C-alpha cells in the first residue's frame, strides 16, 4: 500500500514542490493521499484522464523515474530555464514541477518542435506533459511567439492535437493562466512523438512500470489474492 504523506496524486506525480520526498520503492496495492484541496494542482488547471490514472497506478510492479529527455540539452532551440512560477514556488523562490519543463521562447521566435522517445525494454512507460493556456495574447506572445500555435502528440496507440484556449479565468493562486494535464502510455512496441509551435510543458521525468490487476480496499469519500489456501481449509 503506497501512502503519500504530503499531497494528492496530482502534485506527487507531477512534482508540485511540497511533494518531493515520498517513500521506499514500489510495488503497491493502492494509493493513499493526504488530501490537499486548494493546494493540489499548483499552477491551476484541469487534470485530464485523472481517474483512469487513479486506477492504473493502483496495482503496480515497480516504477522508474528516469530522465525521459533531460531538461538541459534536449531542446537545442527553446529557452529551457525561464518558466517557473509563484503558483508552484519553493523556499519562497518561484519553483516549477520537477518532472516537466515549462518551455518559453528563446529570443523571440519559436520553430517547430521535433522531440520523441522511442521505447525498447518492455515495461509501461508513463509520459506526462502539461499544456498551458495564457491569460491573454500578452501572456501568449511573450512566451510562445506564434499566436497561432499548436501541440500534437503522436503515438500509434494515442493521437491528440491540442490548441490553447486563451481567456482570463478567475484568479487561482494569482494566476489567470490555466494549464492542462495529460498522460499517455507507451508500451514496448511504440515510439512516442511530440511536436509543437507552443504551449507545451514537456516531460523531464517519466515512468517505466508493470501492473497486474487488483486493489479494491480504499477510503469511502476522501499473489496474495486467494493464493492457494491458507493452512486451514485444505491440508489441515
Amino acid at each position, epitope marked *: 500500500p503506497l501512502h503519500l504523506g504530503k499531497c494528492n496524486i496530482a502534485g506527487w506525480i507531477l512534482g508540485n514542490p511540497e511533494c*518531493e*520526498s*515520498l*517513500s*521506499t*520503492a*514500489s510495488s503497491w496495492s493502492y494509493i493513499v493521499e493526504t488530501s490537499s484541496s486548494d493546494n493540489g494542482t499548483c499552477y491551476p488547471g484541469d487534470f485530464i484522464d485523472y481517474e483512469e490514472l487513479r486506477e492504473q497506478l493502483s496495482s503496480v510492479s*515497480s*516504477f*522508474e*523515474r*528516469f*530522465e525521459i*529527455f*533531460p*531538461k*538541459t*540539452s*534536449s531542446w537545442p532551440n527553446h529557452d529551457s530555464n525561464k518558466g517557473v512560477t509563484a503558483a508552484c514556488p519553493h523556499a519562497g523562490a518561484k519553483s516549477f514541477y520537477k518532472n516537466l519543463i515549462w518551455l518559453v521562447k528563446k529570443g523571440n521566435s519559436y520553430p517547430k518542435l521535433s522531440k*520523441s*522517445y*522511442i521505447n*525498447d*525494454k518492455g*515495461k509501461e512507460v508513463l509520459v506526462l506533459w502539461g499544456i498551458h493556456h495564457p491569460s491573454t495574447s500578452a501572456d501568449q506572445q511573450s512566451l510562445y511567439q506564434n499566436a497561432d500555435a499548436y501541440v500534437f502528440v503522436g503515438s500509434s496507440r494515442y493521437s491528440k492535437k491540442f490548441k490553447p484556449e486563451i481567456a482570463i479565468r478567475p484568479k487561482v493562486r494569482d494566476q489567470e493562466g490555466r494549464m492542462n494535464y495529460y498522460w499517455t502510455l507507451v508500451e514496448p512496441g511504440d*515510439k512516442i512523438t511530440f511536436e509543437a509551435t507552443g504551449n507545451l510543458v514537456v516531460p523531464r521525468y517519466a515512468f*517505466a512500470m508493470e501492473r497486474n490487476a487488483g486493489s479494491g480496499i480504499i477510503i469511502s469519500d476522501t499473489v496474495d489474492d486467494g493464493f492457494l489456501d491458507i493452512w486451514t481449509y485444505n491440508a489441515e
Partner: antibody
Amino acid sequence: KLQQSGGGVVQPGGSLRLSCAASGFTFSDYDMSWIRQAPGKGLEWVSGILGGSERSYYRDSVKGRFTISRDNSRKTLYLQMNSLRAEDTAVYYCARHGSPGYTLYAWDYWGQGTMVTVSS
Amino acid sequence: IQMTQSPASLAVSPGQRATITCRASESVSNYGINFINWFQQKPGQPPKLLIYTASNKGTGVPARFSGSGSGTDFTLTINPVEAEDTANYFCQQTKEVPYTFGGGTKLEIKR
C-alpha cells in the same frame, strides 16, 4: 568489451576530433559517452549520446562547442572538440552505459585514455 | 549544478574499513531506485566501477567493498582494507539530470 580513442595537442582555438573504437559488439543499440579527467584533480562528463532517435546530452560548460556523433557499422563514436580553452586540457576516457533493466544507471567501462592537450 | 561532496581524504592502516561518503544537494532517490555509482581511479591511470546505485556490487569487483545509505547521503566502505585499494575514489553523476562527479578522496594506507 573494448575501447580505443585518440588525440594529442592543440594550439588553443583549433578544433580536434577524438575517435573511439568498440568491440564487445551490439554497438547498434547502446548509449556511449566521454568523461575528460582534468589534471591536478579531474572533474566530469562531457557528453552522453543515445542509441536511436539520435539525441545529444552535454555539459553547460561545453554545450555550445562540442559535437558528439557515432557510426554504427564501422562502429565508432567521436568527439569533435571545438574552440579550445586552456581550461579544458584533460585526458579523455571514452565510456559506454549499462542500462538494461529500467533506468540507465551508469557506465561499466572506459578506454585507457587519450591526453588531449591545449597549448601553443 | 546538482553537486556531491566527500568526507575528504583520511587514511588507514591496511587494517580495515574506512568510509568515503557522499552528500547530494537534492534527493537523488525516488525509491527502489537511488542513483549514486561509486568509481575508483588508480592514482596515475584509468577509472573503475565498484558500487553502483549505492548497494549493488559490480560483478567483477572485490567483495570487501560495500555500500549503503538512504537517498540524500551515501557511504562507500571497504572493510578489510587491502594494499590493493588506495586509489582516488569518486561519487557519481547522481540521477539523470546534469551529470556531476563528486571530486574524490585519497585513501592513504599505513604500513
